[PDB]
Amino acid sequence: TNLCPFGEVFNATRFASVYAWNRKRISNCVADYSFLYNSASFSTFKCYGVSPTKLNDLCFTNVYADSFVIRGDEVRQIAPGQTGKIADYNYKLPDDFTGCVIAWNSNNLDSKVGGNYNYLYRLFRKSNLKPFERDISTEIYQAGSTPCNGVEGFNCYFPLQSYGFQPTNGVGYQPYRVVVLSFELLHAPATVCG
Amino acid sequence: IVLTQSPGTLSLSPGERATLSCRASQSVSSSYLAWYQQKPGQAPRLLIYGASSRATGIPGRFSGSGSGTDFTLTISRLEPEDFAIYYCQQGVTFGGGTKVEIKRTVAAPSVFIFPPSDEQLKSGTASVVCLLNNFYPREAKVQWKVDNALQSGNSQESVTEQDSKDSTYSLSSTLTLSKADYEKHKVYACEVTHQGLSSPVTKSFNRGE
Amino acid sequence: EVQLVESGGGLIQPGGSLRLSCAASGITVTSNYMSWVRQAPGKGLEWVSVIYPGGSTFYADSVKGRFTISRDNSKNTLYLQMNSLRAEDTAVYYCARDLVVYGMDVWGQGTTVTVSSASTKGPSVFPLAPSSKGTAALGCLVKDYFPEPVTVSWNSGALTSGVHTFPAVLQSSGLYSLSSVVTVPSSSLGTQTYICNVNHKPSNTKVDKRVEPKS
Ligand SMILES: *[C@@H]1O[C@H](CO)[C@@H](O[C@@H]2O[C@H](CO)[C@@H](O)[C@H](O)[C@H]2NC(C)=O)[C@H](O)[C@H]1NC(C)=O
């Protein structure tokens, strides 16, 4: 059998920061979504435009698996139609999203005593991201009319900020690993079938 | 998220160390907290951000510390301009504030009672005023009594800011009655309880002298 | 200079609308997290609303559906449209630039919003007569006026030592009342006249009340 390598996304030992979210393009394989119905492993499993229980009966042109880490209380922003720092400046789903959003608590892997400062999010950006846009700029953010010329100072801020993930955080503020499955159906032969 | 500041009031002298506490109901991020000072009639002023970083131009005697849920603002050596209200803040949440006031020796209030004027009585209302003058500390209890009945629900009171000369407070309480009710009773008294008084002080008058 | 200059506060009846403005210099409003924070009389700070650099808006539950935050880049100005105002919206409203991880570093000077169904009204001024029973206290009761503020002096400014003019209280009628007192030597009561001078600019009221021992 030629199974789609969803394990490489879901079971990756390390995850990306949300501003630099990872994407794996899945093509030309048999997709077995049975691992999703294994509950007690996922705190969020929400689908849009498809039935969550019928995924094994569906064919798509391609499937995208995006993955990243955010705060628990930010998982609600990974949905069509949402606003907030994550949806606006880090990872944006389209209003007409077709796919599923899966999340689980990763406190045991992604928090550190005194703070894990490796997971970042973009705090400053002049405009919202388009759906599925990925901004990895580290340009100094100009909050006034004076050019920054690459140096931080008043009105001149580094645009990325660290999460302060420590294992004693309240659960809503603990790290969550998120995988977004986008199902792409083009006027073309399907290559990912259940 | 709830931020609880303690104590409500710190009473200290210039030169002394002030320690103000802010406790968060949840551990969020790390060192996630700002501190502000506010003086009467003025907008708040940022003192500390990121729990421990001093805002630009803030004197070095201000320092912040703590993490998880427990945070502290320290003023190492109080200056006279530091007596003020201080707020902590996280995201959209503010703490309830801590007042830093000048400590001084206990001073009992001077107590005065004023009957309503005849001019006011002509209009159908009677206001009886009780004045507590130049006391410290700020906590004081006024109990109105009419023919020895303890009055509840018909008085309001007001307290001055700490006096710039002698660091005392003053308090004014108004008992409001209809004229008809006022004329129904004889003995009007305010009884004052304060730490400077070994026993409560009562000032009274008899309506009609 | 870096400043936020607010305007638009005033007196409004319940159900009415006001628009507050916050004109910025030294920061670019549309490039920042910009917030409104209010402070009711004698109370703490309450976050009201924010607009993100990219345009998303958020509101406290207590103003949702009634207030609208907005901005104008060409005027570099932040606005708060307040509709269906209620008594408990009475407060000083501050605008502030929020750096989120670096605190709220720049604040406006505040603009006062008073929501009340009361009509403008000058005070009645009544004497608080020095007792007949050596320091004496005397004063003036400045009752039933609207809106704030009143000013009180003693003897046209010549008497300042020992004066306490208290914060006004809001009575259940919707009108304010305050007292002003002074302690003086009892031996002065026969030879010194004491007059409180009360000014209520909103109603163009000036009252001079002589306060004397009663008989
Ligand atoms: C991630 O890894 C887990 C554990 O290795 C996988 O869960 C196993 O799935 C197989 C079927 O593919 C079952 O026979 C095992 O019983 C499962 N073990 C556990 C502990 O659940 C999971 O499928 C992987 N995720 C993927 C491939 O997306």
Numbering used by the authors:
A (entry chain A): 333 to 526
B (entry chain L): 2 to 104, 109 to 214
C (entry chain H): 1 to 133, 138 to 219
Describing publication, verbatim:
Cv2.3194, a resilient class 1 anti-RBD antibody, remains active against Omicron sub-variants up to BA.2.86. To define the epitope of Cv2.3194 at atomic level and the antibody’s interactions with the RBM, we crystallized the Cv2.3194 Fab in complex with the RBD from ancestral SARS-CoV-2 (RBDWu) and BA.4/5 (RBDBA.4/5) strains and determined their structures by X-ray crystallography. The structure showed that the antibody binds to residues within the RBM and the buried face of the RBD. The buried surface area (BSA) of Cv2.3194 upon binding is ∼1000 Å2, with the IgH variable domain predominantly contributing and the CDRH3 accounting for one-third of the IgH BSA.
The Cv2.3194 Fab-RBDWu complex produced crystals diffracting to 1.9 Å, allowing us to refine an atomic model to a final Rfree value of 0.21. Structural alignment of the RBDs from the two crystallized complexes showed the same binding mode for Cv2.3194 (root-mean-square deviation of 1.1 Å across 1646 atoms corresponding to VH and VL). An extensive network of polar contacts is found at the interface with Cv2.3194 and the RBDWu, including side chains from residues that are mutated in various VOC (i.e., K417, Q493, N501, Q498). The residue N460 identified by DMS as a potential contacting residue for Cv2.3194 is at the periphery of the epitope, right in front of an electropositive patch on Cv2.3194’s paratope. Thus, the N460K mutation introduces a positive charge inducing an electrostatic repulsion and a bulkier side chain difficult to accommodate in the interface. As a result, this mutation reduced spike-binding affinity and SARS-CoV-2 neutralizing activity of Cv2.3194. Unlike these antibodies, which have a long CDRL3 that interacts with and constrains the CDRH3 and CDRL1 loops, the CDRL3 loop of Cv2.3194 is unusually short, allowing the formation of a cavity in the paratope.
